[PDB]
Scaffold this motif. Structure first.
Motif, PDB file in Angstrom:
ATOM      1  N   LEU C  97       0.846  -1.186   0.000  1.00  0.00           N
ATOM      2  CA  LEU C  97       0.000   0.000   0.000  1.00  0.00           C
ATOM      3  C   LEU C  97       0.883   1.238   0.000  1.00  0.00           C
ATOM      4  O   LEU C  97       1.852   1.313   0.761  1.00  0.00           O
ATOM      5  N   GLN C  98       0.554   2.200  -0.858  1.00  0.00           N
ATOM      6  CA  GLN C  98       1.278   3.464  -0.909  1.00  0.00           C
ATOM      7  C   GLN C  98       0.284   4.609  -1.010  1.00  0.00           C
ATOM      8  O   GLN C  98      -0.615   4.581  -1.852  1.00  0.00           O
ATOM      9  N   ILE C  99       0.447   5.607  -0.148  1.00  0.00           N
ATOM     10  CA  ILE C  99      -0.335   6.837  -0.189  1.00  0.00           C
ATOM     11  C   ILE C  99       0.655   7.967  -0.433  1.00  0.00           C
ATOM     12  O   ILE C  99       1.357   8.400   0.492  1.00  0.00           O
ATOM     13  N   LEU C 100       0.735   8.412  -1.688  1.00  0.00           N
ATOM     14  CA  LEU C 100       1.577   9.532  -2.130  1.00  0.00           C
ATOM     15  C   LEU C 100       3.010   9.235  -1.702  1.00  0.00           C
ATOM     16  O   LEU C 100       3.484   8.106  -1.909  1.00  0.00           O
ATOM     17  N   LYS C 101       3.730  10.192  -1.116  1.00  0.00           N
ATOM     18  CA  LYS C 101       5.013   9.942  -0.478  1.00  0.00           C
ATOM     19  C   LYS C 101       4.906  10.038   1.038  1.00  0.00           C
ATOM     20  O   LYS C 101       5.906  10.290   1.718  1.00  0.00           O
ATOM     21  N   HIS C 102       3.703   9.843   1.579  1.00  0.00           N
ATOM     22  CA  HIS C 102       3.450   9.959   3.006  1.00  0.00           C
ATOM     23  C   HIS C 102       3.260   8.625   3.706  1.00  0.00           C
ATOM     24  O   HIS C 102       3.638   8.500   4.870  1.00  0.00           O
ATOM     25  N   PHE C 103       2.697   7.623   3.034  1.00  0.00           N
ATOM     26  CA  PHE C 103       2.491   6.319   3.650  1.00  0.00           C
ATOM     27  C   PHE C 103       3.012   5.234   2.722  1.00  0.00           C
ATOM     28  O   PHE C 103       2.778   5.285   1.511  1.00  0.00           O
ATOM     29  N   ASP C 104       3.700   4.242   3.287  1.00  0.00           N
ATOM     30  CA  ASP C 104       4.214   3.134   2.486  1.00  0.00           C
ATOM     31  C   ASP C 104       4.309   1.900   3.373  1.00  0.00           C
ATOM     32  O   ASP C 104       5.188   1.825   4.233  1.00  0.00           O
ATOM     33  N   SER C 105       3.420   0.934   3.162  1.00  0.00           N
ATOM     34  CA  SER C 105       3.400  -0.290   3.952  1.00  0.00           C
ATOM     35  C   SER C 105       3.565  -1.495   3.038  1.00  0.00           C
ATOM     36  O   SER C 105       2.953  -1.559   1.967  1.00  0.00           O
ATOM     37  N   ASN C 180       4.629 -24.714   9.336  1.00  0.00           N
ATOM     38  CA  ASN C 180       5.669 -23.689   9.254  1.00  0.00           C
ATOM     39  C   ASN C 180       5.048 -22.440   8.653  1.00  0.00           C
ATOM     40  O   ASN C 180       4.711 -22.435   7.467  1.00  0.00           O
ATOM     41  N   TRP C 181       4.906 -21.376   9.440  1.00  0.00           N
ATOM     42  CA  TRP C 181       4.338 -20.155   8.886  1.00  0.00           C
ATOM     43  C   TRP C 181       5.158 -18.948   9.308  1.00  0.00           C
ATOM     44  O   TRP C 181       5.860 -18.976  10.319  1.00  0.00           O
ATOM     45  N   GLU C 182       5.076 -17.891   8.502  1.00  0.00           N
ATOM     46  CA  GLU C 182       5.959 -16.741   8.637  1.00  0.00           C
ATOM     47  C   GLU C 182       5.231 -15.472   8.218  1.00  0.00           C
ATOM     48  O   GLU C 182       4.463 -15.478   7.253  1.00  0.00           O
ATOM     49  N   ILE C 183       5.487 -14.387   8.950  1.00  0.00           N
ATOM     50  CA  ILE C 183       4.915 -13.071   8.685  1.00  0.00           C
ATOM     51  C   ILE C 183       6.041 -12.048   8.690  1.00  0.00           C
ATOM     52  O   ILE C 183       6.876 -12.045   9.602  1.00  0.00           O
ATOM     53  N   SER C 184       6.071 -11.182   7.677  1.00  0.00           N
ATOM     54  CA  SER C 184       7.046 -10.099   7.602  1.00  0.00           C
ATOM     55  C   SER C 184       6.337  -8.820   7.183  1.00  0.00           C
ATOM     56  O   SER C 184       5.793  -8.748   6.078  1.00  0.00           O
ATOM     57  N   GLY C 185       6.360  -7.812   8.045  1.00  0.00           N
ATOM     58  CA  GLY C 185       5.678  -6.564   7.771  1.00  0.00           C
ATOM     59  C   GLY C 185       6.588  -5.371   7.966  1.00  0.00           C
ATOM     60  O   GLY C 185       7.518  -5.392   8.773  1.00  0.00           O
ATOM     61  N   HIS C 186       6.296  -4.312   7.211  1.00  0.00           N
ATOM     62  CA  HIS C 186       7.085  -3.089   7.245  1.00  0.00           C
ATOM     63  C   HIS C 186       6.166  -1.898   7.021  1.00  0.00           C
ATOM     64  O   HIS C 186       5.261  -1.955   6.185  1.00  0.00           O
ATOM     65  N   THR C 187       6.412  -0.820   7.763  1.00  0.00           N
ATOM     66  CA  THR C 187       5.593   0.383   7.706  1.00  0.00           C
ATOM     67  C   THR C 187       6.501   1.602   7.688  1.00  0.00           C
ATOM     68  O   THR C 187       7.467   1.668   8.454  1.00  0.00           O
ATOM     69  N   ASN C 188       6.197   2.561   6.815  1.00  0.00           N
ATOM     70  CA  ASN C 188       6.953   3.804   6.709  1.00  0.00           C
ATOM     71  C   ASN C 188       5.959   4.953   6.618  1.00  0.00           C
ATOM     72  O   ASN C 188       5.267   5.102   5.606  1.00  0.00           O
ATOM     73  N   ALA C 189       5.888   5.757   7.674  1.00  0.00           N
ATOM     74  CA  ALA C 189       5.043   6.947   7.717  1.00  0.00           C
ATOM     75  C   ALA C 189       5.960   8.163   7.655  1.00  0.00           C
ATOM     76  O   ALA C 189       6.640   8.491   8.632  1.00  0.00           O
ATOM     77  N   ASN C 190       5.988   8.820   6.500  1.00  0.00           N
ATOM     78  CA  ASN C 190       6.804  10.005   6.284  1.00  0.00           C
ATOM     79  C   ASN C 190       5.911  11.238   6.346  1.00  0.00           C
ATOM     80  O   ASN C 190       4.941  11.347   5.590  1.00  0.00           O
ATOM     81  N   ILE C 191       6.243  12.161   7.246  1.00  0.00           N
ATOM     82  CA  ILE C 191       5.526  13.417   7.397  1.00  0.00           C
ATOM     83  C   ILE C 191       6.559  14.536   7.349  1.00  0.00           C
ATOM     84  O   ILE C 191       7.761  14.304   7.488  1.00  0.00           O
ATOM     85  N   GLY C 192       6.075  15.759   7.126  1.00  0.00           N
ATOM     86  CA  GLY C 192       6.976  16.893   6.999  1.00  0.00           C
ATOM     87  C   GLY C 192       7.883  17.089   8.197  1.00  0.00           C
ATOM     88  O   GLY C 192       9.030  17.522   8.049  1.00  0.00           O
ATOM     89  N   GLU C 193       7.395  16.771   9.396  1.00  0.00           N
ATOM     90  CA  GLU C 193       8.182  16.920  10.614  1.00  0.00           C
ATOM     91  C   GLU C 193       8.341  15.614  11.384  1.00  0.00           C
ATOM     92  O   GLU C 193       8.828  15.637  12.520  1.00  0.00           O
ATOM     93  N   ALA C 194       7.946  14.481  10.808  1.00  0.00           N
ATOM     94  CA  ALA C 194       8.047  13.205  11.503  1.00  0.00           C
ATOM     95  C   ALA C 194       8.308  12.095  10.497  1.00  0.00           C
ATOM     96  O   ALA C 194       7.719  12.078   9.414  1.00  0.00           O
ATOM     97  N   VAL C 195       9.198  11.175  10.862  1.00  0.00           N
ATOM     98  CA  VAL C 195       9.503   9.997  10.058  1.00  0.00           C
ATOM     99  C   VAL C 195       9.469   8.785  10.979  1.00  0.00           C
ATOM    100  O   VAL C 195      10.210   8.736  11.968  1.00  0.00           O
ATOM    101  N   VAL C 196       8.618   7.813  10.658  1.00  0.00           N
ATOM    102  CA  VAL C 196       8.490   6.586  11.438  1.00  0.00           C
ATOM    103  C   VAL C 196       8.742   5.404  10.515  1.00  0.00           C
ATOM    104  O   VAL C 196       8.140   5.314   9.439  1.00  0.00           O
ATOM    105  N   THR C 197       9.630   4.503  10.930  1.00  0.00           N
ATOM    106  CA  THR C 197       9.969   3.310  10.157  1.00  0.00           C
ATOM    107  C   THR C 197       9.935   2.103  11.084  1.00  0.00           C
ATOM    108  O   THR C 197      10.826   1.936  11.923  1.00  0.00           O
TER     109      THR C 197
END
Lengths: 250, 250, 250, 250, 250
Positions: C97-105, C180-197
Motif C-alpha cells: 500500500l502506498q499513499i503519495l510519499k506519506h504512507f508506504d506499507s 511452518n508459517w511466517e509473517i514479515s511486515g514493514h511500515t513507513n510513515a513520512n511526514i513533513g516533521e516526523a519519520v516513522v519506520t
C-alpha cells in the motif's frame, strides 16, 4: 518328570523352601493368584505323615463373601537367577556273563541327560494390606447361595484356604531338555546239538524346549479359614502359624 | 508458563480434549490417582461462564466411607508420542523515529524461544470394575467422624468428586526450554543549547531442562457425589453425563 | 483441529459416511464399544436443524438390566488403507500500500501445512446375534436401583441408546503433522516533521507425531431405547430406521 | 464424492443399470445381503418424481416371520473388470481484467484429478429357490412380538422389502484418487493518491488409496411386501414387476 | 450408452433383426432363459406407435401352472463373430468470431471415441419339443394361489408371455471403450475503458473394459398367453404370428 514341575521344585528349594507350595501345572498356575479360595483335604490315612491334597476353585474372596473386602495388590522383586540352572547326567555300564563254553551274554547301556532352566527374574505379588482383609473377613459372612461353603461346613475333612502371596516370573522363562540313551545286548547259547545267537541294538533321542510366558505363577502360600455355624468366617492358626504350606503335622 | 503445564496442555489437546482435567503441578500430581476424593467449588460469580475450582484432599474412598469398597486397579496403553513435540518461535523488530533534526530514536529487539517435550508412552489407570464401586458407594454411608464430609454437607457451593481414571507416563519424560532475547535502543535529542545521546543494550539467555519420573499423573476425570441427610452417599449426573471435566454449564 | 478428530472425519467420510458417529477423543474412545449405554440430549433450540449431544456412561447392558442378556461379540474386516492419507497446503501472499510519499506499507505472509495419517486396517466388532439381545431387552426390566434410568425416565429430552457396532484399528495408527508459517511486515510513515519506520518479522514451526495403539475405537452406531412406566425397556424406531447416527430430523 | 459411491455408480451403470440399487456406504454394505428386510419410505412431496428412501434393518426373514423358511443361498459370476477404470480430468484457466490505468487484475487456476478403480470380479448371490421362499412367506404370519412390523402396518408411507439378490466383489478391490489444484491471483489498484498491490498463491495436493475386502456388497434388488390385517404377509407387484429398484413411479 | 446395450443392439442388428428382443442389462439377463414368464404392459398412449414394456418375473412355467409340463432344453450354434466389431469416431472443430476490434472469440474442440466388442460364438437354447409344451399349457390350469396370474387376469393392459428361445454367448465376451475429448476456448472483449481476456482449457480421458462370462443371455423371443375365466391358460396369436418381439401393432 515334567520340566515345569522340576523347575518349580528347583526354585522352591533355592528360595522359600519353607512356607511355599509348588504349582501343580501350567494350566492351573493361574488359579493360585492372591485372594483365591482353595480346598484342603486331609490324607485320612496318615495325616501326620502325609501332606494334604490341595484343590483349586473358581472363586475369589469377594465372590465367596456376602460382604466385599478390599482387593488391591502390589508386587516386588524376590529373587533373580542370573544364569540358567544347568544339569548334566552321563551313565554308562557293561555286563559280561559266561557259563563255561555253553552260555555267553554281553550287554551294555548308556544314557546322557541334559537340562537347562532360565527363569530370569521372579517377583512376589500380595495384598497391599492384609490386616484390613483379615478384619473384614472376620466381620463378614459367607454367601448363603454358594454350595462349596455349605459342603465344606458339613464335611469335617475339607478346609478352606485363602491365598495371600504368589511368586510369578517377570519375563518369559525357557526350559530345555535333551535325552539320548542306548542299549546293546548279545546272547550266545551253545549246546551240543543247538546254537543260538541273538543280538539287539536300540537307541532313543528326545528333545523338548518350551517357554512359559510372563505372569505364570510358580508357588504360593495360604492361610486357613473356618466356617462358623452361621455364614460367618473365622481365621484359624495352628500353633499361631497363620501361614500354611500344606505340610504334615508331624 | 511452567513447562509441566505447557506439556499437560499439549497432551490434553492432542488426546482427550474432552472429559479430561489437567494436573496443576508435579507435586500435587500424585494426589489425583483413581479412587481419590476431590472438592469442587463453584465460581459464585459466573457459574455458567467460568470453570469451577478443584481442590485435592488426602482421602481415599475407603477412608471416607464407613463401609469399604473394592479398590483393585488396572492399566492399559492410551497414546504414544513417537517423536518429541518441538516448537520454535523467532521474532525480530526494529523501530526508527525522527522529528526534524531535533529528535532521533532507534530501537530494536529480537527473541528466540525453543521448546521440546518427550512424553514417551502414556498409559491410563482405572478401577477394574466401576459398577461394583458405584453400587457399594450408593449402599454405603460416609464416615461420621470425618469433618470434610460434614463441611461439604452443610455448605452449598462445595461438591465431592471421585476420581475414576488417570493418565500417567510409563517412562521418564524430558522437558527442555531455551530462551534468548535481546534489546538495543538509542536516543538522540538535539536542541540548540543541549545535546543528549543515550544508548542501552541488554540480552538475556535462559535454559531449563527437567525430567519427570515414571508414574507422574498428567490428567484425570471424576464423577460427582452428593451427601444425603444421613451419612449415605449418592451419585449425581448432570444430564446423565456421569463424567465431569470441570467445565462450565454454559 | 486435533489430529485424531481430523483422522476420524477422514475415515468416516471415506467409509460409512451414513449411519456412523465419530469418536470425540482418544480417552473416551474406549467407552463406545458394543453393548454400551449412551445418553442422547436434544438440541432444545433447533432440534430439526442441529445434531443432538451424545454423552458416554460407565454402564453395560447387563449392568443396566435386571435380567442379563447374551454378550458375545465377533469382529471382521471393514476397510484397509493401503497407503497413508497425505495432505499438503501451501499459501503465500503479499500486500503493498502506498499513499503519495506519506504512507508506504509492505506486508507478506506464508504458510506450509503437511499432514499424514496411517490407519492401517480397520475392523468392525459387533454382537454375534443382535436379534436375541433385542428380544431379551424387550422382555427384560431395567435396574430399579440405577439412578440414570430413573433420570432418563422422568426427563423428556434425555434418551437412551445401545451401541451395536464399533470400528477399531487392528494395528497401531500413526498421525503426523508439520506446520511452518511466517509473517514479515514493514511500515513507513513520512511526514513533513516526523519519520516513522517500523519492521516486524516472525515465524513459527511446529511438529506433532503420535501413535494410537491397536484396539482404539474410531466410530460407532447405536439403537434407541425407551423406558416404560415400569422398569421394562422397549426399542424405538424413527420411521423404522433402528440405526441412529445422531443426525437431525430435518 | 466418496470413492466407494463413485465406484458403485460406475459398476451399476456398466452392468445392471436397471433393477439395481446402489449401496450407501461400506459400513452398511453388509446389511443388504439376500433375505434381509428393509424399509421403504415414500417421498411424500413428489412421489412420482423423486426416488424413495431405503432404510436398513437388523432383521432376516426367519426372524421377522413366526414360521421359518428355507434360507440356502448360491453364488455365480456376473461380470469381470479385466482392467481398472481410469479417469483423468485436467483444467486450466486464466482471466485478465484491465480498467484504463486504474485497475489491473490477473487470476489463474489449474486442477488435475485422477481416479482409478479395480473391482476385479463381481459375483451375484441369491437364494437357491425363490418360489419356495415366496410360497412360505405367503402362507406364514409375521412375528407378533416384533415392533417394526406393527409400525409398518399402522403407518401408510412405510413399506417392507425383502432383498433377493446381491452383487459382491469376489476379491479385494482397490480405489485410488489423486487431486492437485492451484490458484494464483494478483490485483493492482492504481489511484492518483493510492497504490494497492495484492498477490495470493495457494495449491492443495491430496491422495487417498483404500482397499475394500472380499465379500463387500455393491448393489441389490428387492421385492415388496404387504402386512395383512393379521400377522400374515403377502407379496405385492406394481404392474407385475415383482422387482423394485427404488425408482419413482413416473 | 452402456457397452452391454450397444453390443446387444449390434448383435440383434447383425443377426435376428426381426423376432428378437434385446436384454435390458447383465443383471437381469439371467431371467430371460427359455420357459420363463414375463409381463407385457401396453403403452396406453400410442399403442400402435410405441413398443410395449417388458417386465421380468421370478417364475417358470411349472411353478405358474398347477399341472407340470416337460422342460428339457437343447442348444445349437447360431452365429460366430470371427473378428471383433471395431468402431472409431474422430471429430474436430474450430470457431472464430470477430466483431470489429471490440470482440474476438476463438473456440475449438476435439473428440476421439473407440469401441471394440468380441462376442466370440453365440448359441441358441430352446425347448426340445415346443408342441408338447403348448399342448400341456392349453390343457393345464394356472396356480390358484399365485397372485400375479390373478392380477393379470383382472387387469386389461397386462399380458403374459412365455419365453421360448434365448441367445447366449458360448464363451467369455470382451467389451472395451476408450474416450478422449478436449475443449479449448478464448475470449477477448476490448472496450475503450475495459479489457477482458479469458481462457479455458480442459480435456477428459476415460477407458472401460469388461468381460461378460459364458452363458450370459443376449436376446429372446416369447409367445403370448391368455388367462381364461378359470385358471385355464390359452395361447393367443396376433394374425397367427405366435412369435412376439415386443413390436408396436402399427
Amino acid at each position: 518328570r515334567p520340566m515345569f514341575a522340576v523347575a518349580v521344585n528347583e526354585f522352591i528349594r533355592s528360595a522359600g523352601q519353607d512356607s511355599l507350595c509348588g504349582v501343580p501345572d501350567i494350566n492351573s498356575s493361574g488359579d493360585f493368584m492372591p485372594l483365591h479360595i482353595i480346598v484342603k483335604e486331609v490324607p485320612k490315612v496318615l495325616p501326620c505323615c502325609r501332606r494334604p491334597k490341595i484343590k483349586r476353585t473358581p472363586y475369589t474372596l469377594n465372590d465367596i463373601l456376602d460382604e466385599p473386602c478390599p482387593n488391591q495388590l502390589k508386587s516386588s522383586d524376590l529373587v533373580t537367577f542370573t544364569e540358567p540352572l544347568v544339569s548334566n547326567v552321563k551313565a554308562s555300564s557293561s555286563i559280561g556273563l559266561q557259563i563255561l563254553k555253553h552260555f555267553d551274554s554281553g550287554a551294555k547301556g548308556s544314557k546322557n541327560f541334559i537340562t537347562s532352566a532360565s527363569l530370569g527374574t521372579v517377583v512376589k505379588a500380595e495384598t497391599i494390606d492384609i490386616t484390613k482383609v483379615l478384619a473384614k473377613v472376620r466381620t463378614a459372612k459367607a454367601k448363603v447361595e454358594n454350595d462349596l461353603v455349605s459342603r465344606v461346613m458339613k464335611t469335617k475333612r475339607l478346609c478352606l484356604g485363602l491365598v495371600v502371596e504368589t511368586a510369578c516370573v517377570a519375563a518369559a522363562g525357557k526350559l530345555t531338555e535333551a535325552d539320548n540313551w542306548e542299549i546293546s545286548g548279545h546272547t550266545n547259547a551253545n549246546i551240543g546239538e543247538a546254537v543260538v545267537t541273538a543280538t539287539a541294538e536300540l537307541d532313543k533321542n528326545l528333545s523338548r524346549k518350551i517357554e512359559i510366558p510372563p505372569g505364570t505363577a510358580l508357588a504360593y502360600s495360604f492361610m486357613d479359614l473356618e466356617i462358623l455355624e452361621d455364614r460367618s468366617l473365622r481365621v484359624s492358626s495352628s500353633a499361631g502359624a497363620m501361614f500354611d504350606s500344606g505340610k504334615a503335622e508331624s
